[PDB]
């Protein structure tokens, strides 16, 4: 089924 | 003074959900206000060790608590993170934290008055479920209300979370809502479709993700910050600014909370409110750079932002702006021209007056500004005129058509306003005229005193001209007898036969057809 993301890849600084 | 083994230990900071209640910022708490339970733990100690120890320490069964380590991320957030309590339970404290010292962990527990009533730490399938945080935004109070957290399967659709949100917020069921994700400071993205599942709805779905919601209501538009998106852009740009009254010396001032993205109008509105008054009644000042104090006046129509105005403050000083409260409206104040001239009253004496017509105005306007201000004489005309004087001679009378922009008082005493005498109101145009009169004595460049307009009559004879001069000129017969009277044009003069010469009107007219050049005038020869 559907899963969570492992880490956050967007909108870094 | 560390002592031998201090380097084998780490600080673990535990934060409880009650610390999230009240927070108005991004994420779950403000690092500077949060209250921790602090543990000093061996770096090499295990997870089960700390967990059991913590259980007994805190007054909860070990089965009934859950640990969510706090995770500082490159995207500018600190968020609770997933920890498998069993799988990873034999890794070390320093391991599990990736060498963060101090290490912060969110500790989930049960009420436990609800735990007396039987409730338990919920099912968490680390693969198919997600823990989400819920915040409710109220536009009326402009605030965030912490609504706690939920567990839900990932595949559950956004629409199914609405009743829990309505419940936690005190909303009557089936109230329409707007949902946002709080991604990070200055990014709040509206969730467009409630009918998809959580993995599609949220940006990159993780435990600790935040949903912010609000009533979808027309009264929201009455608020200064109608949506959570706006609320968070505002909070991201907030800046405190001290305002001082320029007129009032040494004034410490008052602090107003503003946003760097505000324009002239918005700033005006806020400061105008804290003073209880019309924003149109204020004028503001820019900064002098490094010197404290008021700089140049800020036009009402300024196009920039508060950030532009604040850009010259260094990293740490108080940011400070000066204003002035205005007796009048600022668009008018800006366009106001200060016209200084002489009022000449019924007693033939001069007073200094400053009138303020509109700079686009005309002579008629300046005149009535002056008429509003003064006492006229006795019987008289109630009609005024404007003279232009240079070197104690009248160079000309001004017509009311004339725009005020056509004059330049190169001197403060150049312009005179005076009440028109009764004999001069409407002159009999064929047989009499007005002449300008000035005092001189050696030469005709030797002028002094107060000049004036005199009526002279055709065929009339000079002695009663001398008498007409007499009655107005304030003084008596002796060195009025000093006087020798001349007709003057440009370069030179000649002295009227004091008798007998009978007035011939234009020994005083200019060359026929020529207006622009200054007329002949009647000179008075006497000293002071």
Numbering used by the authors:
A (entry chain B): 617 to 629
B (entry chain A): 556 to 1083
Sentences from the paper on this structure:
The ubiquitin specific protease 7 (USP7), also known as herpes virus associated ubiquitin specific protease (HAUSP), is a well-characterized deubiquitinase. USP7 is comprised of three recognizable domains: the N-terminal TRAF domain, the catalytic domain, and the C-terminal Tandem UBL domain (designated TUDUSP7).
As observed in previous studies, UBL1–2, UBL3, and UBL4–5 of TUDUSP7 form three separate modules and are connected by flexible regions flanking the UBL3. Residue K624ICP0 snugly inserts into an acidic cavity, with the side chain stabilized by residues E759USP7 and D764USP7. Consistent with the observation from the structural analyses, mutations K624AICP0 (1KA) and K620A/K624AICP0 (2KA) of ICP0, largely decreased the binding affinities to TUDUSP7, compared with the wild-type ICP0, supporting the key role of these residues in mediating the intermolecular interaction. Structural comparison of USP7-DNMT1 and USP7-ICP0 indicates that ICP0 and KG-LinkerDNMT1 pack against the same acidic pocket of TUDUSP7 in an opposite orientation.
